[PDB]
């Protein structure tokens, strides 16, 4: 599975097999899944972040119109398929990434994919 | 495949599917393979490091009796299966890892497996 691929939500244990970070959020922004690659990139513990809020608890630098604001618009409208660059920084070393956020096929969850730039 | 597993060299595209860093070295310490997870952990570019020396070029903090010295003894003797903690630092943010070094099944290459502590 390639980062950014048009069919990524269709294709999506095995989550840890992805070569890039993958976080599954619900519409409230709480973490349902968080793979090994995302812990590799950020130093956050995949076990500790499940059930926490991505935008308000785990990665508060993302609580901005440029990231959380896009997520909330996407959840409200059902239209979410966006790539952009961002810097993660909270309680970690500042790390520049490329982010792809996309609504899941079910419409009940939302994916955040991450790779280092 | 679990980090540290007794049969890891037997089990070892697919390399990027591993949930932890994996580097294949030859007996001279030059890099033959370097997976996505190791780039995720360190910020080093998996494309750029192939054919470079791990101990002298890519990760010179490892040029120590505690890491390179164990590698050289392992290559010389054929006996290499060791776990230890280490900090990577060269041209990156200091990152504490657990390392497992093990001779490959063929005896012509040597694996370095890495996870964040
Ligand atoms: Cl809010
Ligand atoms: Cl952050
Ligand atoms: Cl994260
Ligand atoms: Cl280093
Ligand atoms: Cl490395
Ligand atoms: Cl030397």
Numbering used by the authors:
A (entry chain B), B (entry chain A): 4 to 15, 21 to 125
Text of the article:
PYP is a highly soluble globular protein from the PAS domain superfamily. Apo-PYP, as expressed in cells, forms a covalent complex with the chromophore, p-coumaric acid (pCA), a process that is analogous to covalent drug binding. While not a drug target in the conventional sense, it shares chemical characteristics with common covalent drug targets, especially those with reactive cysteines. Utilizing this spectrometer, we employed photoactive yellow protein (PYP) and its covalently attached chromophore p-coumaric acid (pCA) as a representative framework for many cysteine-based covalent inhibitors.
Each nitrile-containing PYP variant was previously characterized in the holo-form (covalently attached to pCA) via X-ray crystallography to high-resolution (<1.2 Å), where the nitriles adopt a single, well-defined orientation at each site. However, when apo-PYP nitrile frequencies were compared to previous measurements conducted on the purified holo-PYP (with pCA covalently attached), significant differences in peak frequency were noted for variants F92oCNF and F96oCNF. 24 The current simulations in the absence of the chromophore significantly favor decreased hydrogen bonding of the nitrile to T90 in apo-F92oCNF, consistent with the IR measurements showing a blue shift upon chromophore incorporation. Additionally, AMOEBA simulations reveal a small increase in hydrogen-bonded population (nitrile-to-solvent) for the apo-F96oCNF variant upon pCA binding. However, the small but definite change in solvent hydrogen bonding to the nitrile in F96oCNF presents a reasonable explanation for the smaller blue shift undergone by the nitrile upon pCA binding.
